[PDB]
Amino acid sequence: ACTKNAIAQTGFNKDKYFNGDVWYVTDYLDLEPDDVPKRYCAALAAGTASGKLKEALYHYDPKTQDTFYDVSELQVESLGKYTANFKKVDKNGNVKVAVTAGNYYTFTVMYADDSSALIHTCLHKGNKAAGDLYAVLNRNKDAAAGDKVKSAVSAATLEFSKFISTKENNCAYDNDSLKSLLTK
Numbered sequence: 001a002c003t004k005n006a007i008a009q010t011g012f013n014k015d016k017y018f019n020g021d022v023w024y025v026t027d028y029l030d031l032e033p034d035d036v037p038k039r040y041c042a043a044l045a046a047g048t049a050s051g052k053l054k055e056a057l058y059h060y061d062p063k064t065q066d067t068f069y070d071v072s073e074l075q076v077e078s079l080g081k082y083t084a085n086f087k088k089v090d091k092n093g094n095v096k097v098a099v100t101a102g103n104y105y106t107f108t109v110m111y112a113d114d115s116s117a118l119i120h121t122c123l124h125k126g127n128k129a130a131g132d133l134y135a136v137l138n139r140n141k142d143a144a145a146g147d148k149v150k151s152a153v154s155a156a157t158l159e160f161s162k163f164i165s166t167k168e169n170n171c172a173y174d175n176d177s178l179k180s181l182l183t184k
């Protein structure tokens with residue numbers, strides 16, 4: 001299902017990435033066909049909350065209106081490479097689906113700077129078939145991918161021309177919920 005051992009950025013700066021702020025997905029590449037929709041909105045917050053490494057996720061399908069949030073405790077495999085549980089929550093952190101063995105994702109930061117990043121994730125959810133998902137992130141939801149992150153896509157032996165943009169979906173995000181979910 002997933003096939004890639006993504007390599008984390010050399011010299012990854014964890015405190016800068018996990019600073020409590022929001023990252024927007026601007027472009028994505030799924031290696032498995034028919035795995036995710038062709039139009040999508042996603043964002044996350046990443047930070048340490050009371051000593052615990054956390055991510056809060058948001059997904060929105062702009063055609064179906066399917067919406068869900070997750071809160072994730074990350075465990076460290078190596079610098080920039082994590083295994084995350086997930087619990088599905090409402091935007092206020094109330095649990096809808098508890099943490100469960102077999103529901104996890106891996107998360108590898110392949111490149112990051114203050115404004116942009118390239119990540120890989122492999123999602124394992126119960127019975128479902130997994131597939132490699134790469135995402136270009138930016139701190140600014142409207143930013144076109146710049147040369148640092150596009151060069152990193154090339155250095156991963158990927159073609160940025162294959163990535164699908166999220167920019168034409170009228171995506172609107174609740175940054176406040178993502179930040180507050182880090183504590184939940």
Ligand code: HEM
Nearest residue numbers: 025028036037040042059070086087088105121123125135
């Ligand atoms: C930003 C990095 C991402 C991470 C870490 C991530 C992680 C996850 C997790 C944990 C779930 C399961 C949530 C739950 O059931 O509670 C999920 C579901 C899903 N994600 Fe992502 N995701 C990311 C980005 C994306 C992107 C960019 C897309 C496609 C444009 C996408 C498409 C989906 C879809 C379609 C599901 C629903 C799968 C199902 O039917 O259960 N995700 N994702």
